[PDB]
Structures are given as structure tokens and as C-alpha cells.
Amino acid sequence: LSTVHPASPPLLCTREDVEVAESPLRVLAETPDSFEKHIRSILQRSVANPAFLKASEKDIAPPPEECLQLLSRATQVFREQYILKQDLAKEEIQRRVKL
Amino acid sequence: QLESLINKWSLELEDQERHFLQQATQVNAWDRTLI
Amino acid sequence: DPVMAGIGEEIAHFQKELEELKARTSKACFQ
């Protein structure tokens, strides 16, 4: 990444609507990225899996117990930092489009 | 074998993340047009 | 060995979750 992005504010979307005459979206017209930057905030990872170097045809085959611990670490990071955040992307884009 | 499944699914989720950003951009253009 | 089989079940569960996410995403017609 070309930039050292700091973390954004906590969620611009616990707004309950209020009517009178003007649209709440006039505040979100001033900055061009306002909704894209919100989705880019909710998608933001605090932890990932590292990229793994392929094992050699000369290495010792590992005891199965640690492969299960490595995979249980891996799918949990995916469930906690990707899948959940992409379902929150969807619920946000659904609510935006309906308005 | 295992390492290559983890590396592959990491790239498959980073690709879906780009799919959501390109959807958010399209909504943002209809939003401006409705203002 | 049941460790090897449990690994072979969770790989087949998580890949199904990932296909089910891609199906839930590609079905999201935002217009």
C-alpha cells in the first residue's frame, strides 16, 4: 500500500432519521468518497493470516495435531476479520440502496 | 498442501473485498445524482 | 486417524462457507 492509513472513526451509521425539509445526504455531498470510505472503514483488518512458504519435498511430515491448530487459527481469522466484515459491508450497502 | 489452501482462500476473500468497494462506488454516484 | 478426518471435514465446511459467501455476494443486485 502507498499510504500508512490510520484507523477511521467508529461508524457513521447509528443515525436515526429526522425530517424537516432538507436531506441528511447534503453533509455527505461535500466529500466525494464519503460512502466508499465508510465501506473501506468497515472492511479494515486488525489481524490477517501471513503468507505461507510451500513446504519442501525433503521436509519431515508434521504430527497431525499442529496442522489442526494452524487451520483452526486460519479459518478463525477469516471468519472474524474477512467474512463478518464483508457481511457488514452487505448490510450497510443494502440499507444505503433502500434509502 | 494445507499452506496452499490458506494462501488461496486469502486471495479469494481479498477479491470479494474489492467487489464490495466497486459496489460502494456505484451507489455513491446514484446518491449524488439523487441529491 | 480421526485428527486427519476432522481436518478433512472443516476444510470442506470452510470452503462451503466461502462458496456460500460468493453466492450471497454475486446474488446482491444493487440497482
Swiss-Prot record, chain A:
Compartments in which it is found: Nucleus, Nuclear pore complex
Phosphothreonine modification, residue list: T31
Function: Component of nuclear pore complex.
Domain of life: Eukaryota
This protein's name: Nuclear pore complex protein Nup88
Disulfide-bonded cysteines: none
Tissue: Ubiquitous.
Disease implication from the record: Fetal akinesia deformation sequence 4: A clinically and genetically heterogeneous group of disorders with congenital malformations related to impaired fetal movement. Clinical features include fetal akinesia, intrauterine growth retardation, polyhydramnios, arthrogryposis, pulmonary hypoplasia, craniofacial abnormalities, and cryptorchidism. FADS4 inheritance is autosomal recessive.
Phosphoserine modifications at: S23, S46
Origin organism lineage: Eukaryota, Metazoa, Chordata, Craniata, Vertebrata
Swiss-Prot record, chain B:
Domains (record comment): Contains FG repeats.
Record PTM: O-glycosylated. Contains about 10 N-acetylglucosamine side chain sites predicted for the entire protein, among which only one in the C-terminal.
Family indicated by similarity: Belongs to the nucleoporin NSP1/NUP62 family.
Organism encoding this protein: Homo sapiens (Human)
Subunit note: Component of the p62 complex, a complex at least composed of NUP62, NUP54, and NUP58. Interacts with NUP88. Interacts with NUTF2. Interacts with HIKESHI. Interacts with OSBPL8. Interacts with CAPG. Interacts with SAS6 and TUBG1 at the centrosome. Interacts with MCM3AP isoform GANP.
Compartments, record wording: Nucleus, Nuclear pore complex; Cytoplasm, Cytoskeleton, Spindle pole; Nucleus envelope; Cytoplasm, Cytoskeleton, Microtubule organizing center, Centrosome
Gene from which the chain derives: NUP62
Full-protein interval shown: 332 to 366 of 522
Name of this chain's protein: Nuclear pore glycoprotein p62
Domain of life of the source: Eukaryota
Biological role: Essential component of the nuclear pore complex. The N-terminal is probably involved in nucleocytoplasmic transport. The C-terminal is involved in protein-protein interaction probably via coiled-coil formation, promotes its association with centrosomes and may function in anchorage of p62 to the pore complex. Plays a role in mitotic cell cycle progression by regulating centrosome segregation, centriole maturation and spindle orientation. It might be involved in protein recruitment to the centrosome after nuclear breakdown.
Illness the protein is tied to: Infantile striatonigral degeneration: Neurological disorder characterized by symmetrical degeneration of the caudate nucleus, putamen, and occasionally the globus pallidus, with little involvement of the rest of the brain. The clinical features include developmental regression, choreoathetosis, dystonia, spasticity, dysphagia, failure to thrive, nystagmus, optic atrophy, and intellectual disability.
Curated annotation (Swiss-Prot), chain C:
Domain remark in the UniProt entry: Contains FG repeats. FG repeats are interaction sites for karyopherins (importins, exportins) and form probably an affinity gradient, guiding the transport proteins unidirectionally with their cargo through the NPC. FG repeat regions are highly flexible and lack ordered secondary structure. The overall conservation of FG repeats regarding exact sequence, spacing, and repeat unit length is limited.
Domain of life: Eukaryota
Self-association state and partner proteins as the record states: Homodimer. Part of the nuclear pore complex (NPC). Interacts with NUP88. Interacts with ZFP36; this interaction increases upon lipopolysaccharide (LPS) stimulation. Interacts with DDX19. Interacts with XPO1. Interacts with XPO5.
Boundaries of the shown chain within the full protein: 700 to 730 of 2090
Post-translational modification: Probably glycosylated as it reacts with wheat germ agglutinin (WGA).
Role noted for this protein: Part of the nuclear pore complex. Has a critical role in nucleocytoplasmic transport. May serve as a docking site in the receptor-mediated import of substrates across the nuclear pore complex. (Microbial infection) Required for capsid disassembly of the human adenovirus 5 (HadV-5) leading to release of the viral genome to the nucleus (in vitro).
Name by which UniProt lists this protein: Nuclear pore complex protein Nup214
Tissue specificity as recorded in UniProt: Expressed in thymus, spleen, bone marrow, kidney, brain and testis, but hardly in all other tissues or in whole embryos during development.
Localization per Swiss-Prot or TrEMBL: Nucleus, Nuclear pore complex
Associated clinical condition: A chromosomal aberration involving NUP214 is found in a subset of acute myeloid leukemia (AML); also known as acute non-lymphocytic leukemia. Translocation t(6;9)(p23;q34) with DEK. It results in the formation of a DEK-CAN fusion gene. A chromosomal aberration involving NUP214 is found in some cases of acute undifferentiated leukemia (AUL). Translocation t(6;9)(q21;q34.1) with SET.
